[PDB]
Amino acid sequence: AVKKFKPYTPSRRFMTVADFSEITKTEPEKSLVKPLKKTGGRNNQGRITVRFRGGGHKRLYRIIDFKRWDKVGIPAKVAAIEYDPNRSARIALLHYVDGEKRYIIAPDGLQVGQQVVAGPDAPIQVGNALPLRFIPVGTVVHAVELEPKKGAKLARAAGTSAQIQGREGDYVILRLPSGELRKVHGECYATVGAVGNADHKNIVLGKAGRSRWLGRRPHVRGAAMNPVDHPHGGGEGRAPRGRPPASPWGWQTKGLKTRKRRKPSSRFIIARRKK
Amino acid sequence: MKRTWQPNRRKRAKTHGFRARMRTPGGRKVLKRRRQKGRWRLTPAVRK
RNA sequence: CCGAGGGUAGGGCCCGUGACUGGGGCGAAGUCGUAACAAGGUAGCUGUACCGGAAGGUGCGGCUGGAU
RNA sequence: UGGGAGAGGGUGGUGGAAUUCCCGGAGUAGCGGUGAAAUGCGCAGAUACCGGGAGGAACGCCGAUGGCGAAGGCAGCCACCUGGUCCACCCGUGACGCUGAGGCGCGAAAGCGUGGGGAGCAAACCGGAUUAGAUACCCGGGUAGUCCACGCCCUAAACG
RNA sequence: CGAUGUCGGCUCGUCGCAUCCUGGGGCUGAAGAAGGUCCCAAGGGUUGGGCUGUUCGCCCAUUAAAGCGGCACGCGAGCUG
RNA sequence: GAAUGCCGGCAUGAGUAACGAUAAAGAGGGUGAGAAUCCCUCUCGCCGUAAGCCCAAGGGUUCCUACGCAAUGGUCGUCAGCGUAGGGUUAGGCGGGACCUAAGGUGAAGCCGAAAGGCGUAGCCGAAGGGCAGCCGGUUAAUAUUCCGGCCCUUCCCGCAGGUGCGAUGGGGGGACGCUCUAGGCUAGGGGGACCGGAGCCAUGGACGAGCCCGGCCAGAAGCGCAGGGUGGGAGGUAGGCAAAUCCGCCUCCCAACAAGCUCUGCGUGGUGGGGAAGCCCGGGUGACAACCCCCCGAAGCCAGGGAGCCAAGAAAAGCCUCUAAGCACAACCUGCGGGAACCCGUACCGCAAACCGACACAGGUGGGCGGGUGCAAGAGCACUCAGGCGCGCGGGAGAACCCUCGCCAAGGAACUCUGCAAGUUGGCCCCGUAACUUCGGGAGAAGGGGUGCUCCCUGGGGUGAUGAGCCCCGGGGAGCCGCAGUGAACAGGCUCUGGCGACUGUUUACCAAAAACACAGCUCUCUGCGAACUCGUAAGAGGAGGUAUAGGGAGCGACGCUUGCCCGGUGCCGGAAGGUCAAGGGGAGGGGUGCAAGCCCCGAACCGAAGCCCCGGUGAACGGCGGCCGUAACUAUAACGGUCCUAAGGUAGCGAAAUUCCUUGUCGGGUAAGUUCCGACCUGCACGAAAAGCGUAACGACCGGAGCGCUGUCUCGGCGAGGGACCCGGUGAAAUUGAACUGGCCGUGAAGAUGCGGCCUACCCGUGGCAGGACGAAAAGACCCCGUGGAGCUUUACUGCAGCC
RNA sequence: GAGCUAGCCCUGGCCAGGGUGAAGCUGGGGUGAGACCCAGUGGAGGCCCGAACCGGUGGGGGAUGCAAACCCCUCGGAUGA
Numbered sequence A: 001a002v003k004k005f006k007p008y009t010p011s012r013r014f015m016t017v018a019d020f021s022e023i024t025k026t027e028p029e030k031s032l033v034k035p036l037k038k039t040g041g042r043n044n045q046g047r048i049t050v051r052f053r054g055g056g057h058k059r060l061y062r063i064i065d066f067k068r069w070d071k072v073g074i075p076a077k078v079a080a081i082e083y084d085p086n087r088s089a090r091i092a093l094l095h096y097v098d099g100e101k102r103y104i105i106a107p108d109g110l111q112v113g114q115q116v117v118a119g120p121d122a123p124i125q126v127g128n129a130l131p132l133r134f135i136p137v138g139t140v141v142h143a144v145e146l147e148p149k150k151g152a153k154l155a156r157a158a159g160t161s162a163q164i165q166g167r168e169g170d171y172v173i174l175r176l177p178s179g180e181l182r183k184v185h186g187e188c189y190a191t192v193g194a195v196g197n198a199d200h201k202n203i204v205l206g207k208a209g210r211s212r213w214l215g216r217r218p219h220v221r222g223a224a225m226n227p228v229d230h231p232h233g234g235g236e237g238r239a240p241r242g243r244p245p246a247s248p249w250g251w252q253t254k255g256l257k258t259r260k261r262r263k264p265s266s267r268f269i270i271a272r273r274k275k
Numbered sequence B: 001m002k003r004t005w006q007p008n009r010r011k012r013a014k015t016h017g018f019r020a021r022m023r024t025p026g027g028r029k030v031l032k033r034r035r036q037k038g039r040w041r042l043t044p045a046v047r048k
Numbered sequence C: 001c002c003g004a005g006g007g008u009a010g011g012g013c014c015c016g017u018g019a020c021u022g023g024g025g026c027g028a029a030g031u032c033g034u035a036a037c038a039a040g041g042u043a044g045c046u047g048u049a050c051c052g053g054a055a056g057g058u059g060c061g062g063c064u065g066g067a068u
Numbered sequence D: 001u002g003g004g005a006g007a008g009g010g011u012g013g014u015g016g017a018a019u020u021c022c023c024g025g026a027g028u029a030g031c032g033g034u035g036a037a038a039u040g041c042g043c044a045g046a047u048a049c050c051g052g053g054a055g056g057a058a059c060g061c062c063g064a065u066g067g068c069g070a071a072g073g074c075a076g077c078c079a080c081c082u083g084g085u086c087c088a089c090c091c092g093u094g095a096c097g098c099u100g101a102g103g104c105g106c107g108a109a110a111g112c113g114u115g116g117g118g119a120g121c122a123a124a125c126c127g128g129a130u131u132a133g134a135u136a137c138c139c140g141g142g143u144a145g146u147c148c149a150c151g152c153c154c155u156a157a158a159c160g
Numbered sequence E: 001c002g003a004u005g006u007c008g009g010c011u012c013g014u015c016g017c018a019u020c021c022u023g024g025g026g027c028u029g030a031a032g033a034a035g036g037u038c039c040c041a042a043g044g045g046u047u048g049g050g051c052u053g054u055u056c057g058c059c060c061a062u063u064a065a066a067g068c069g070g071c072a073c074g075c076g077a078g079c080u081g
Numbered sequence F: 001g002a003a004u005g006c007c008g009g010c011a012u013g014a015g016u017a018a019c020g021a022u023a024a025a026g027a028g029g030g031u032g033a034g035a036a037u038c039c040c041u042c043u044c045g046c047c048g049u050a051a052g053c054c055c056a057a058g059g060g061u062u063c064c065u066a067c068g069c070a071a072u073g074g075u076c077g078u079c080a081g082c083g084u085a086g087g088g089u090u091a092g093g094c095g096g097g098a099c100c101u102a103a104g105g106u107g108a109a110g111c112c113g114a115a116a117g118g119c120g121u122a123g124c125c126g127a128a129g130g131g132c133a134g135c136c137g138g139u140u141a142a143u144a145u146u147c148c149g150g151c152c153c154u155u156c157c158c159g160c161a162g163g164u165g166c167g168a169u170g171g172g173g174g175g176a177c178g179c180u181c182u183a184g185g186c187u188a189g190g191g192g193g194a195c196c197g198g199a200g201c202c203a204u205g206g207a208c209g210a211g212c213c214c215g216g217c218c219a220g221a222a223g224c225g226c227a228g229g230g231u232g233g234g235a236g237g238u239a240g241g242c243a244a245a246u247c248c249g250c251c252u253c254c255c256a257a258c259a260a261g262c263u264c265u266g267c268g269u270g271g272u273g274g275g276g277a278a279g280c281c282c283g284g285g286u287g288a289c290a291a292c293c294c295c296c297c298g299a300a301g302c303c304a305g306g307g308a309g310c311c312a313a314g315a316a317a318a319g320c321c322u323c324u325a326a327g328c329a330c331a332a333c334c335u336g337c338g339g340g341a342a343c344c345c346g347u348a349c350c351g352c353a354a355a356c357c358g359a360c361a362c363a364g365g366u367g368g369g370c371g372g373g374u375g376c377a378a379g380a381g382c383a384c385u386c387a388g389g390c391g392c393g394c395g396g397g398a399g400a401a402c403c404c405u406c407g408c409c410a411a412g413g414a415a416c417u418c419u420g421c422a423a424g425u426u427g428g429c430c431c432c433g434u435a436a437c438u439u440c441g442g443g444a445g446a447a448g449g450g451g452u453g454c455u456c457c458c459u460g461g462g463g464u465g466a467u468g469a470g471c472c473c474c475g476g477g478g479a480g481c482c483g484c485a486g487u488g489a490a491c492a493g494g495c496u497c498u499g500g501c502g503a504c505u506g507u508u509u510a511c512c513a514a515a516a517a518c519a520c521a522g523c524u525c526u527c528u529g530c531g532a533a534c535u536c537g538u539a540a541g542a543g544g545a546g547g548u549a550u551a552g553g554g555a556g557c558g559a560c561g562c563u564u565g566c567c568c569g570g571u572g573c574c575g576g577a578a579g580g581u582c583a584a585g586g587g588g589a590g591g592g593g594u595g596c597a598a599g600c601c602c603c604g605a606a607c608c609g610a611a612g613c614c615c616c617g618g619u620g621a622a623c624g625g626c627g628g629c630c631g632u633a634a635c636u637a638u639a640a641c642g643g644u645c646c647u648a649a650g651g652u653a654g655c656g657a658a659a660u661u662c663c664u665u666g667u668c669g670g671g672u673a674a675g676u677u678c679c680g681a682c683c684u685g686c687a688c689g690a691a692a693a694g695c696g697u698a699a700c701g702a703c704c705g706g707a708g709c710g711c712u713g714u715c716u717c718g719g720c721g722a723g724g725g726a727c728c729c730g731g732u733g734a735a736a737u738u739g740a741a742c743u744g745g746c747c748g749u750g751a752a753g754a755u756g757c758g759g760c761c762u763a764c765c766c767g768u769g770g771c772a773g774g775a776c777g778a779a780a781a782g783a784c785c786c787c788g789u790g791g792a793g794c795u796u797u798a799c800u801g802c803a804g805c806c
Numbered sequence G: 001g002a003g004c005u006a007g008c009c010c011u012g013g014c015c016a017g018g019g020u021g022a023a024g025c026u027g028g029g030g031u032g033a034g035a036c037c038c039a040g041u042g043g044a045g046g047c048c049c050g051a052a053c054c055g056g057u058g059g060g061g062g063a064u065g066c067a068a069a070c071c072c073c074u075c076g077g078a079u080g081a
């Protein structure tokens, strides 16, 4: 896990790469890939609305199955585990015993050639999906719908998970990957097990070039700009921020909470995030 | 060095052409004004 | 051909020396405190960590070479 | 060969007590702390009481002058994996032994790297005291760390 | 202010004399030698370097001496920058 | 009569600068009124990874021929891309369209917006991407994969025969894919031949030779041959591929498996069709029944959708194949053969340039392919040269100063200078050898040296072929020869020690700054639970993201190492259901106006009443801040120590005369003969200091310092030489500027710096080459400065408002 | 008005030749098994020389220019941001 390199270039001594040892197939299922339109951070008006984006490697988008309740009771074999460049997690190729082929994000521990299934009567096993109400209290879980039949929304990234803390009426209590305590409907589906590829955070990009490969263009500090461009612009020589540190758009960027106060989901957020 | 005029027939007709003008209000008012001024030609000549 | 050596170039070892800087030994009666020897007035010693004008203090574990 | 004792080690799981916190209830004028106090906490409803929930660390009684380990060291309980040792029978090998410069491995605490974890405790730091002073002992706070995994550190009143 | 280019250097000189040297002098607390001071005198001469943008200044090695000033702090339609 | 007025005309500078790469010219013979300039020949130089050839843009008759020379052409002109006229561009296969999709554009549906309009699924458009059928040669003054010749092929229609469950905008397969490295076999291309064909040639001392010179092929249908690519067979089940499905997917079983078979390409051969040199003679004729053979090298191209590895994970749709739906099975589809049908547009010429973009026939700019040979290690580098193309559209002289580009230099050798600026030196390859330090890779081309040609002899292996010869590729040893010198010409690091800044590769002020600046991996803080936060938009809608806290936004800091202390009093931000203030609204004690009165109408206290602010806490890798005075030790000196005032707290580690130090060239040491710079120290740090990070740091740097070595024209201190200019002659012929000018020096005066006034001195009239002191020379209505109640960018706890948010 | 310039999207193209020799793989040594070491193979890299190409460091020229940014000598990078 995490391959290092000898320092034979300046950049190599810090660059690290994934071990890729869990991957078993190196080309995607043609039936489940579709072209991925690179935006470069521009919208239908043409304007950059997310700065510092563009120019990374071309990608194909693997269609992933965030529902899984559309095939209740139909077991599937884990055919392969594959690379997905659209996400931090690895994906698992499923061959359903009724013929259909799908991708799911690969939980940790999932091995090729094993049965998985979804439904209220499913066993509590790494890779199975159930409504949250049918999962024992205290089990880690991932790919969690935030509302019934609306799609898996929570605990998607590599290594993430969500622990079930308790039950209350139609609602179970989840500890999200951020540490927030939240109520999620018991009818929402979830997949027992944490998402795999936990060493994804120990990867060291080693040089600027790798960031460019990922479609990340160089970020330029407000302190480097001019007053026309940024609150931190200007100064003779260097200059401390000389005001509360602000975004390019004036609003303060140290501690200022921005969650909408009257947002209706607040009635279901038990505790804001930790740390 | 590389100068500002780099002719390109597709570009010329797609940018200043008759069909480009008629598509927007400002383009139609150009044509109205040029037609009123008596301009022999309302749009750049590009041989296509 | 070899050849004393001369020469150019780059290494190794040792000795002397250097603005300044580090502590050390030693030197009857200078200054600050009082850490240790009595339970030495916070039992002491301890490896380490961090701190403090200075002896020292404190955490963590260890020893009795600790009184009662 | 057949037995026996044991906190010997490693892995996964797990059980209750207590502390802190959070939510609900009930209740009101103080609580806390000391040699005595103050800082601090409390009518913005604390402390004391009940129910609930979260989380970490440590395992009371048994417990001992006890047991095991080469040493460091090892204590809730369950299971897996594994080390050492003792005894009986007197069956096998037939001196195959003792030690051990180098080597290699192990090695309390503290400390270090990358992640995680964080209740309690607590270097540093802050405050209240004491005091001539108090960079201390006492008190209220309190961050590393204390905990887990992996990788280094290799020291000790590592002592009989 | 419908523009008189601003330091220093380089190059090229030219002038003044309140003279650094060389020539002539008087006084000397001028024995000699060598000095001090003042007078006359502008003919000629008045070095090579280290440092600094430097002018100046300090220092090295010399020297008969290593003079002081003016010429838009001489000289950028001559150069340097 | 003046407006740096406006329009025009004509002057001045002036026969002046220049006439656009220094690749280069000369003579003869032509034509003509006229010739350095046009034509022809011979000689000379120049490009030759082009300065040659073929495409694509863009240009649009500039192409060909005839007739011209007014203007255009930097001179000339008989010439021309100029003027006039006539001619010239031929395709089912090349390119595009009647085929397909990409971004994007458009857009029935739907959504949104005062209007105009903005979105938007399908669908439509959109190509240098996918798909699709022509190759060799001949012919014209000018077109040719287009005309013609030879050999091939595609689609549509109809027919005939055979076969089959046929049938699609519907399902599926396929199309269909990255980067780096890469195998086998070929081909393009090239090298060689003592073999084959050829008009000849023997010089000038030798050669009648295994002599010189020239050439030795291109295309090709079926078949065959070599080399590859693609591809399991069959059956049973089947809930999935939005109806069906015999297909596809999933499952089971049987047999084949590195073959084979089928299928498709490439290369070879291939019936036949072409081509065919030098030389000689007038583009052609001959050569010539031309020959058309062997060997070697060999692609980056072909087989290809091959193989391997790697992470950053690598379009779509149609053609095509298959499956079935309605339907239809007299049909329809497939297969084979035959006849018939096959439209629109481009096609000239230029295309690294005199035809494109730069006002010019402009030393600049412009995408793709081919780009021969020899040698130098290789190569597209460099020198020469082939095919081919040019001698750059002013020339002839002269042989000054001076300028440019270049060569050399006695002795010295950085003494030059802000600075070794510049120019030397070094320089490729092989081998020997190589330091501190280091993150263990590096530093390293360290530094420093040796070798390098040619001949003869002996020999090792490789490729091809066959194992041999031959060619060809890497070497090894020994003896020699020559020169001043052997990468003999061309192309080809000067080196070292020590600081500063930044880790680094990168990036930037197009046109004065390439850096220490920006970026950067990495660290931290912070926001964000997803209809996310944030961004653009009135909105719809997008982006974020078809992502989900190991994620996405914002901010500082900026690899790595060791680290980042104290202050929450002020500002920000975060938390706080109490309290205080607080708007509309609720409330209506209590008044008022009016009317005869019911009534109508107006004012209006208490009290209830958000956010915000007050208030209570928190918070620094939030904005920020991190003291003063006096005294004291048994010599002096200095204060471990104490006293006191203030604060929210009084700067911790580490650094320090520094990219920071005013006094300052601080002081001491080092280096030097001498050192305001440099390096090392010290510490009264005017005014370092810890993520506007602090102290280090190997490696890196066209960054900025200091030193040394090497070597020099930088210098003492200049000299000579070359060429292109300057100069003279012929041709063409500008420019800024210009009140008019008959335009001297001194000392004065004058608005204070006089050719122009005074006095004096000096001076015959006009040029040409030179130098720049003056004409307060030219240029720009000073860019500094002030002034204007002139303007603009920027800031903020200036005013006021608006978005946004509450 | 993005036919210049800037960023992004889509689809194509280009980058001679020569150096260095990462991981892995193999064999060998080592050990209880390991780590590990040696050789070979291998061919990594915002690696090195150097064109084409992209630039524009220093100097000189040019300055009514060949050119409203050029010429010469030199120089940065050149499988990648």
Ligand SMILES: CCC[C@H]1[C@H](O)[C@@H](N)[C@@H](O[C@H]2[C@H](O[C@@H]3O[C@H](CO)[C@@H](O[C@H]4O[C@@H](CN)[C@@H](O)[C@H](O)[C@H]4N)[C@H]3O)[C@@H](O)[C@H](N)C[C@@H]2N)O[C@@H]1CO
Pocket: C025, C027, C030
């Ligand atoms: C004439 C010389 C007299 C001297 C004495 O000989 C010295 N020993 C010294 O004496 C000091 C003495 O100074 C100590 O004596 C030692 C120097 O000589 C040193 O103390 C240290 O001694 C070390 C051993 N040489 C260690 O034990 C440790 O570092 C100290 N204890 C000094 O700090 C001090 O402690 C006493 N309070 C006062 C006393 N007069 O200084 C004196 C000067 O006046």
Ligand SMILES: [Mg+2]
Pocket: A003, A004, A005, A006, A012, A013, A014, A015, A016
């Ligand atoms: Mg690494």
Ligand SMILES: [Mg+2]
Pocket: A006, A007
């Ligand atoms: Mg390493």
Ligand SMILES: [Mg+2]
Pocket: A018, A019, A020, A021, A022, A023, A090, A197
């Ligand atoms: Mg993996």
Ligand SMILES: [Mg+2]
Pocket: A030, A031, A033, A034
């Ligand atoms: Mg698809």
Ligand SMILES: [Mg+2]
Pocket: A037, A038, A039
């Ligand atoms: Mg997208």
Ligand SMILES: [Mg+2]
Pocket: A044
């Ligand atoms: Mg759009």
Ligand SMILES: [Mg+2]
Pocket: A049, A050, A051, F535
């Ligand atoms: Mg943005």
Ligand SMILES: [Mg+2]
Pocket: A040, A041, A042, A048, A050, A051, A052, A053, A054
């Ligand atoms: Mg962007």
Ligand SMILES: [Mg+2]
Pocket: A086, A087, A088, A089, A156, A157, A158, F547
């Ligand atoms: Mg993801």
Ligand SMILES: [Mg+2]
Pocket: A082, A083, A084, A085, A087, A088, A089, A090, A091
């Ligand atoms: Mg993945």
Ligand SMILES: [Mg+2]
Pocket: A146, A147, A148, A183, A184, A185, A188
């Ligand atoms: Mg829910």
Ligand SMILES: [Mg+2]
Pocket: A201, A202, A203, A204, A205
């Ligand atoms: Mg990381």
Ligand SMILES: [Mg+2]
Pocket: A056, A057, A058, A059, A213, A214, A215
């Ligand atoms: Mg990417």
Ligand SMILES: [Mg+2]
Pocket: none
């Ligand atoms: Mg980043």
Ligand SMILES: [Mg+2]
Pocket: A219, A220, A221
């Ligand atoms: Mg940045």
